[PDB]
PDB file of C-alpha atoms and ligand atoms in Angstrom:
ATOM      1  CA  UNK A   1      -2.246  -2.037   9.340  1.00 48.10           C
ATOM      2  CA  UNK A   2       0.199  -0.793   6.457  1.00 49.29           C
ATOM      3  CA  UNK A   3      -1.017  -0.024   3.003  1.00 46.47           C
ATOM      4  CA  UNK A   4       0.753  -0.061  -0.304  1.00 46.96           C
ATOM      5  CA  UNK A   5      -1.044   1.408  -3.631  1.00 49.46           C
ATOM      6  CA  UNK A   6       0.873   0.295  -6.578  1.00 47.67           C
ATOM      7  CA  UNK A   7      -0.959   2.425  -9.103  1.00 47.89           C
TER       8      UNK A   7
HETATM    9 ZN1   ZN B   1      -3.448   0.809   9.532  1.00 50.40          ZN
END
């Protein structure tokens, strides 16, 4: 699976 962190 892909991940994204929008911090
Ligand atoms: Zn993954």
């Amino acid at each position: 699976g892909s991940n994204q962190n929008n911090f």
